[PDB]
Amino acid sequence: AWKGEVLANNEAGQVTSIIYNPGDVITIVAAGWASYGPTQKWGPQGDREHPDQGLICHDAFCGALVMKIGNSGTIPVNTGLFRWVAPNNVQGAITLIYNDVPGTYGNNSGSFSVNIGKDQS
Ligand SMILES: *C(=O)c1ccc(O[C@@H]2O[C@H](CO)[C@H](O)[C@H](O)[C@H]2O)cc1
Ligand SMILES: [Ca+2]
């Protein structure tokens, strides 16, 4: 399993040790407070009131936790995933990323502590 932090200001994303393979079932639990600029802090679900103006993931609110599996598109993680299975032809290292607009990560603060584990299958 993997346990670590994902800094909101980390545009490249946090690479984990989790290699998602075909047929894998995974569980992710994320917690913490982070910001995409404002003094206020939000959770892994981001800011439900903030409009999407170029986010790396259009399927989640700004300030939410997302991930990539291999060289796939951004996938919503939010508070986490319970016994989750990836789409077909999706595989590779899991990279956790703070959902924000490309090139704006500079003024982000906080982070998310995240737990990733593979489930029995
Ligand atoms: C509108 O209510 C509003 C717009 C922007 C904002 O902060 C910026 O949000 C950007 C993402 O949309 C980007 O992350 C900037 O760096 C932030 O300063 C708050 C509220
Ligand atoms: Ca920002």
Author numbering: 1 to 121
Paper text:
Because hydrophobic groups in the sugar anomeric position have been shown to enhance the affinity of galactosides to LecA,[3b, 14] acetyl-protected 4-carboxyphenyl β-galactoside (GalA) was attached to the peptide dendrimer. Similarly, the structure of the GalAG0–LecA complex shows the phenyl group in the hydrophobic groove adjacent to the carbohydrate binding site and the “face-to-edge” interaction with the C(ɛ)–H group of His50. Binding of the tripeptide portion of GalAG0 to LecA causes an average 0.66 Å inward movement of the phenyl linker relative to the position of the nitrophenyl moiety of NPG. This movement triggers concomitant inward movements of the interacting Glu49-His50-Pro51 loop of 0.45 Å on LecA. Overall, tighter surface interactions between LecA and GalAG0 are observed relative to NPG. However, an intermolecular T-stack of an aromatic ring with the C(ɛ)–H group of the histidine imidazole side chain at a distance of 2.5 Å is unprecedented. This interaction probably contributes favorably to the binding of the phenyl galactoside to the lectin. The strongest binding was observed with the second-generation glycopeptide dendrimer GalAG2. This dendrimer contains an aromatic aglycone linker that engages in an unprecedented T-stack interaction with His50 at the LecA galactose binding site, as evidenced by X-ray crystallography.
In the case of the opportunistic pathogen Pseudomonas aeruginosa, which causes lethal airway infections in cystic fibrosis and immunocompromised patients, the formation of biofilms plays an important role in antibiotic resistance and disease progression. Biofilm formation is mediated in part by the galactose-specific lectin LecA (PA-IL) and the fucose-specific lectin LecB (PA-IIL), as evidenced by studies with deletion mutants and the partial inhibitory effect of simple fucose and galactose derivatives in vitro and in vivo.[5a, 6] Understanding the glycoconjugate–lectin interaction is a key feature in developing potent biofilm inhibitors. Herein we report the first case of P. aeruginosa biofilm inhibition with a multivalent ligand targeting the galactose-specific lectin LecA, using the related β-phenylgalactosyl peptide dendrimer GalAG2. The structures of the lectin–ligand complexes were investigated to gain insight into the molecular basis of glycopeptide dendrimer–lectin interactions.
